[PDB]
Design a protein around this ligand. Structure first.
Ligand SMILES: Nc1ncnc2c1ncn2[C@@H]1O[C@H](COP(=O)(O)OP(=O)(O)OP(=O)(O)O)[C@@H](O)[C@H]1O
Ligand SMILES: Nc1ncnc2c1ncn2[C@@H]1O[C@H](COP(=O)(O)OP(=O)(O)OP(=O)(O)O)[C@@H](O)[C@H]1O
Ligand SMILES: Nc1ncnc2c1ncn2[C@@H]1O[C@H](COP(=O)(O)OP(=O)(O)O)[C@@H](O)[C@H]1O
Lengths: 51, 479, 501, 478, 145
């Protein structure tokens, strides 16, 4: 019983640690995708309008 | 006349002017000649893509920008460039414009096909579907080629693609009695040189007596201008084209790299007054791959089987050049940095690599079940592996704990050594037969050889040799 | 001694001068802005001619239009009047060359920035001498030595092979470059440390270390001040390449160290941008690929027909945050002969050098390293790759198999062999010693963290007791039974010596 | 005296000036413009050329606020590059972007002046000795030793205590060694510029009366300044520093902060110069301008110009080119990771990238070298375990890895140097530590002498004996 | 209303006017602080001014940089936030404390405009949506503030 209670608190902290980690990583992904494709767009538009 | 001036030269882009009497058509070979830094009679060949009004035209040069100076003569040949093709044009290595760069005797230049030509319509395409076995384990199991198809080496950052081409050429050039041709298109020159040395070694070039060489090498340098590199593929393709219609034999193409060609086209298109595109490339990428992968088609007149290396930059797929190259391929082999990191070679993730010629009825409905079972347990392992990396295999439940070790053996078993890669491995490779392959996998996926250690499957050609190495490993576990 | 003899040489230089009929192309300078000179007129100017100004800050004509010519300022021309008669020099960026360079810090305009005095030089080496020919050249069949252990162990460098050092900053890239330079002390290897676009204090530090190690008797450092104009900062690797061509073309095989190449791409980018030649992706001009292609393809191995020397190249490129998907470390990995990494993790975690062979690779293989190390441990590269994966796999270490326990402790001790101290360039025979010590499982039973002490004890013991081993094998390059016997013999002896104690 | 004439175009900050067709001015030289104003037509409009642009026209950069002037103003070519007062005239005087004393003191004597920029010093005129001096901040003195006469890079984003770390460093070395101590402010918060100026006045290193006894030359350039002014103040301050290293022949302390604002001014002026952009936004010439501002810093044969430069890493982006040039261009990278300040350590310095080429056995002693090693191996291992310990919790490690995490966080909180100037910000009057600390705190941590006192028991205390006394106090309070 | 002079243009206003508005607020605040009194200016919100100036720049076709914002924006904000200080009794020791409101996005303090105005101010003041939906009103996070 204590074994599968320690496993339960292991998972009950691991799920929430995974949730805050995916929150941070999702924000990191959104910022990274935003930054990459904005740099892409402004770069290609610089190359296109530089004529 | 047709003699014009070169008004602007910026990189390998050359703005040629002309009197209003003549302004030539596109794709035509132009040759400024007779000048160099040494007063030499050095010529430069340059073809035209965009003609920018006032009887003037911006061209791309297939040799270096040095030498020629603005306000210089230029002699257009009144025609698109023509490549010397023929059985006399086997053996020797030659230029994009066709000049034999083997520095011994030039081939007889009498039959020159134009480098830009029509693509064969599908009424001429041999719709005959066929199967090809090439002796490399994971390929002839899971990505079986079409003897007639188009074959893709989606490679990563210099991992196993060129050595794969060397191995595969070594295994099948002797096999295919028809003509064969390597196109070195922006290939690294010392490894094209090593390939040429291996053709001299294995006698497929037959260095002492040529034109019996069923292989024919044409190469274009990395260090050559992108004006050269954006047509060297067309040169090799036209040699194969001549052999596919005039000779109409079984013809084998091994160009490397097609993405070199793409990058050269992008490279000049930025210069020759054109907009960019999505990341990487020119806006003409799709039509470039259209010209290529519509001209490399096994015809009802004559078969062809073109393999080609595709280096993706950043080792991905969302990249636009492989986003159209997959769409123009039919036998796709996608390599992986991960499987190269674990040494497994060829580092193809079998998940990504597929083929149209993996239909059950056309591979054998038991061979297909072999392929499905391996792809199933393999993909499930590639799913499971991060959960492993956080919760332990010994925790990860048994009905999948068997399959993770099973497919973990599977991939390393289908890592098999090559007769050239022995310089990188230590043991000379093996030419594996597909019956031996499906046999060993019918052991592993079933779970007959679950008793073996996993590293007994490491880098082993045949499953009986894997049992032999397994007995050796057990013996050394005693000793 | 001055003004007392030189008058006759003054007469010699004056009388007998040219008074030439030299018709020249001459340009009225129109638009100088920020290191470039868009010049009016100047029609018959070869792209790549140096163009002499009023000043003397000469300039290369890169681009050229129907009206203007894109000309850079090699040497920043801080005062150039509009309309100045800026004529070309006619010749194309030629470079004077001699063996008397061997030690002088030299600038990209072939100029001694050593303080040692000017160099007499005869030939005029072109700046864009092409690659050596395809048929003309042989495969890289001959070893060239690292001095660092793990590179020659798993991922060999060869004379003519152009391995690419790569990695983040501050991880010992320049350090391992200088180490594999001053490894070359008796191998008849010219080194050309082309320093590009970094601290002159740093290049002074490395020439200080070279003056310490004596290696500046034969090496040629092309410095590049970070204040040097970006035209010069991208030009200098071409100068180093042609200078190494000058020695490879005789017979003399050589080595080159670009340091770095990423600043070369950046400086060249700046020049192309001010030239208004439009950028490709990642704001770079597209043909940094072409630039580095022309650079590295001028580095190869000669064959017997033309001199059988070599120009093995080490272009370091800098990649931020451990990326590979940066644009220049995406071009140069395709155009190099395989690449080696210095992960910040592996450096700061003690593996110094930090070449994680999971991502590191040398793509010509054993044929460019010695047959002794071949016959010993060709397989050890893939063995250590499996050990790296399985040690990542042995995170789940609850009930390891006994065989995988042996394998993990084995590759553990192997990785501990691949530790080496700062600037201790081991004899290649000593690398054979430690590589056989690893591959023959003597160290398997031994203490796992005292393997460095076991190795220094063992190498001292063999270098004293049986120095005939290293000379017979260095004369045969082959791991024979005599090598085996001497090895296992001193292995028993020094294993006893370090067991007690 | 030189070519008078007319500005033909003004475009905000940048300006395009036509001239007599005969003689155009130099490139990189200066020239004032008279212009106009409300009251009087002052020579406040100093200007500086950038690009001779055809039709006897030069495109030039401004130095001050440039409204009110118009096309056709009476431009005055001063011909020379921008001169600037040097000498004892500098000492103590808080003068401005062109050298005029804006400290509400006397106009300093122009008997000794110097142009704004010059060539790079020579390959030989570099020094040879890998000079090292400590500061008193223990994380630096452990794992990022400071090449004195070389370059000392301060990285980090905003709100991470970088200017405050500079205030602490100058708070030490103002009355510590070194001769003239030239602070320059490139784009500084001007209230903080006058703040540390008042800290110099109170601390007395600068002089109220007889100001020519200062060994301090605080030539700030405020953040408010136009982009030409921000683009030039770095060259002013380094002109002072090289003047002292060549004329005082002195080891000059060269606090500058933060040169990212300088190169951003360069980017901003290029965007109106019409030079095409570069990586993500900046000028195409960021490489060469950073090369100028670096290569004209050197430790000479006699003047070890120790430069303490900050770089505002924008939005904590290390792969940005404005870092990526500088920490190629400097010796002691010190990146200040923001997340450590989120945790609450002050200063907030990682060990992994904060590094030096001074960290060599043959410079710091092999003992101190391996000291820094045995720190760094452990903390890098802690990060490699951190990114998988935060997910799935603490005790899934080995006993060994658990102890190693404990000891790594021991070193981490142990490097929480309480700052002597930060008392007015936090409350704790900071402490000074040295080389006996540098060996011994490491030694007790790594040996396991201190191995039961909690993570607070070495928190915000420099001295390890002070950590022991703090441990005694917190164990007493229970 | 005697303590304030409310400056209000809204999102209907052209981005130029929204760009000039806080400059005008700072100007009249300079007149009032300059006339011997303490004053307090509430930029609200300055990120909207960044967006407006970015639009004005793009319609001016000036090539934007970091995060598609122009490189000017740091000097831009330095203008209207370095005009806000406390003078000394040399000129009447008025003070111009300022609260430039910057509404960040998802807590991305490492986004260009927020890290920019942090690089010019006298420190952060936090406000997490999590502490706001955690009932703690106001929601200032004192560990980072
Ligand atoms: N085998 C080794 N043992 C210990 N330290 C090493 C070793 N190899 C390299 N280093 C260290 O790496 C540090 C950084 O050197 P180096 O400048 O070459 O790195 P880098 O990445 O090239 O930096 P930069 O690119 O800025 O020059 C040096 O201080 C050196 O001591
Ligand atoms: N070392 C420190 N000691 C005390 N408080 C600090 C420290 N570092 C940061 N803080 C707190 O954080 C606030 C802002 O951080 P900090 O001052 O480090 O940024 P900064 O120095 O302005 O950075 P930069 O100077 O690079 O712009 C300070 O006002 C202070 O309240
Ligand atoms: N597991 C492996 N098996 C075979 N070769 C490998 C392996 N790992 C690395 N290599 C190296 O990779 C190189 C081939 O890479 P490849 O992609 O074929 O060519 P390139 O690197 O020119 O693109 C070989 O020369 C070899 O040294």
């Amino acid at each position: 019983a204590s074994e599968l209670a320690a496993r339960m608190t292991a998972m009950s902290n691991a799920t929430d640690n995974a949730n805050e980690l995916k929150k941070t990583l999702s924000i990191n992904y959104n910022r990274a995708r935003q930054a990459k494709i904005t740099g892409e767009i402004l770069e290609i538009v610089a190359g296109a309008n530089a004529c | 006349k047709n003699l014009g001036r070169i008004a602007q030269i910026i990189g390998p882009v050359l703005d040629v002017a002309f009197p209003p009497g003549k302004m030539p058509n596109i794709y035509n070979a132009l040759i400024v000649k007779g000048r160099d830094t040494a007063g030499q009679p050095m010529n430069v060949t340059c073809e035209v893509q965009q003609l920018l009004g006032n009887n003037r035209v911006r061209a791309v040069a297939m040799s270096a920008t040095d030498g020629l100076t603005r306000g210089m003569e230029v002699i257009d040949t009144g025609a698109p460039l023509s490549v010397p093709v023929g059985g006399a044009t086997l053996g020797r290595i030659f230029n994009v414009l066709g000049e034999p760069v083997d520095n011994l005797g030039p081939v007889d230049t009498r039959t020159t096909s134009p480098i830009h030509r029509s693509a064969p319509a599908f009424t001429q395409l041999d719709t005959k579907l066929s199967i090809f076995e090439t002796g490399i384990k994971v390929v002839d199991l899971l990505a079986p080629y079409r003897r007639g198809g188009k074959i893709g080496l989606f490679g990563g950052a210099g991992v196993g693609k060129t050595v794969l081409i060397m191995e595969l050429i070594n295994n099948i050039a002797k096999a295919h009695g028809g003509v064969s041709v390597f196109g070195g298109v922006g290939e690294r020159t010392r490894e094209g040189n090593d390939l040429y040395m291996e053709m001299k070694e294995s006698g497929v070039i037959n260095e002492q007596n040529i034109a019996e060489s069923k292989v024919a090498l044409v190469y274009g340098q990395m260090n050559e201008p992108p004006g050269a590199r954006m047509r060297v593929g067309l040169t090799a393709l036209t040699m194969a084209e001549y052999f596919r219609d005039v000779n109409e034999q079984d013809v084998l193409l091994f160009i490397d790299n097609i993405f070199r060609f793409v990058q050269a086209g992008s490279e000049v298109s930025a210069l020759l007054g054109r907009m960019p595109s999505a990341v990487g490339y020119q806006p003409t990428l799709s039509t470039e791959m259209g010209s290529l992968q519509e001209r490399i088609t096994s015809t009802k007149e004559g078969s062809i089987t073109s393999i080609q290396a595709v280096y993706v930059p950043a080792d991905d797929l969302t990249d636009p050049a492989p986003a159209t190259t997959f769409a123009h391929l039919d036998a796709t082999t996608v390599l992986s940095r991960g499987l190269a990191a674990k040494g497994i070679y060829p580092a193809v993730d079998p998940l990504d690599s597929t083929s149209t010629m993996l239909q059950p009825r056309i591979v054998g409905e038991e061979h297909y079940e072999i392929a499905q079972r391996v792809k199933e347990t393999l993909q499930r392992y590639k799913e499971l592996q991060d959960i492993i990396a956080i919760l332990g295999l010994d925790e990860l439940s048994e009905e999948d704990r068997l399959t993770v070790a099973r497919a973990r053996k599977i991939e390393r078993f289908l890592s098999q050594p090559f007769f050239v890669a022995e310089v990188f491995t230590g043991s000379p490779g093996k030419y594996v037969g597909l019956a031996e392959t499906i046999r060993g996998f019918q052991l592993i996926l079933s779970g007959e050889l679950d008793s073996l250690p996993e590293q007994a499957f490491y880098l082993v050609g045949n499953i009986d040799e894997a049992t032999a190495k397994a007995m050796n490993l057990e013996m050394e576990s005693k000793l | 001694i001055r003004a007392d003899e030189i008058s006759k040489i003054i007469r010699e230089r004056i009388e007998g001068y040219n008074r030439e009929v030299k018709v020249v192309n001459t340009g009225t300078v129109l638009q100088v802005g920020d290191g470039i000179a868009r010049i009016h007129g100047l029609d018959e100017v070869m792209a790549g001619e140096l163009v002499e100004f009023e000043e003397g800050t000469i300039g290369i004509a890169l681009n050229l239009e129907s009206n203007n010519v894109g000309v850079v300022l090699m040497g920043d021309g801080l005062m150039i009047q509009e309309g100045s008669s800026v004529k070309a020099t006619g010749r194309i960026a030629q470079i004077p060359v001699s063996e008397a360079y061997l030690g002088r810090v030299i600038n990209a305009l072939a100029k001694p920035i050593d303080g040692r005095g000017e160099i007499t030089a005869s030939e005029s080496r072109l700046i864009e001498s092409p690659a050596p020919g395809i048929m003309s050249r042989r495969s890289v069949y001959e070893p060239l030595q690292t001095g660092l252990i793990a590179i020659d162990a798993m991922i060999p460098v060869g004379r003519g092979q152009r391995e690419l050092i790569i990695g983040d900053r501050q991880t010992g890239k320049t350090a391992v470059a200088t180490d594999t330079i001053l490894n070359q002390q008796g191998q008849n290897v010219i080194c050309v440390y082309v320093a590009i676009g970094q601290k002159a204090s740093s290049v002074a530090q490395v020439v200080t270390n070279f003056q310490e190690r004596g290696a500046m008797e034969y090496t040629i450092v092309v410095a590049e001040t970070a204040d040097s104009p970006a035209t010069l900062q991208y030009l200098a690797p071409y100068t180093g390449a042609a200078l190494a061509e000058y020695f490879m073309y005789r017979e003399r095989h050589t080595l080159i160290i670009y340091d770095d190449l990423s600043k070369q791409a950046q400086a060249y980018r700046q020049m192309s941008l001010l030239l208004r030649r439009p950028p490709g992706r990642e704001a770079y001009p597209g043909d940094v690929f072409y630039l580095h292609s022309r650079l590295l393809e001028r580095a190869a191995k000669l064959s017997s027909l033309l001199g059988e020397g070599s120009m093995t190249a080490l272009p370091i490129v800098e990649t931020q945050a451990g990326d590979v998907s940066a644009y220049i470390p995406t071009n140069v990995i395709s155009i190099t002969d395989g690449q080696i990494f210095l992960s910040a993790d592996l450096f700061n975690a003690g593996i110094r050098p930090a070449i994680n062979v999971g991502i590191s690779v040398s793509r010509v293989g054993s044929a460019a390293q010695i047959k002794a190390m071949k016959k010993v441990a060709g397989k050890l590269k893939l063995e250590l790759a499996q050990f790296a994966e399985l040690e990542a796999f042995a995170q789940f270490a609850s009930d390891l198999d006994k065989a995988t326990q042996n394998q993990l402790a084995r590759g553990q001790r192997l990785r501990e062999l691949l530790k080496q101290p700062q600037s201790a360039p081991l004899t290649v025979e000593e690398q054979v010693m430690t590589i056989y010590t690893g591959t023959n499982g003597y160290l398997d039973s031994l203490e796992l963290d005292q393997v460095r002490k076991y190795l220094v004890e063992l190498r001292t013991y063999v270098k004293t007791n049986k120095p005939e081993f290293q000379e017979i094998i260095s004369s045969t390059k082959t791991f024979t039974e005599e090598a085996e016997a001497l090895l296992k013999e001193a292995i028993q002896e020094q294993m006893e010596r370090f067991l007690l104690q």
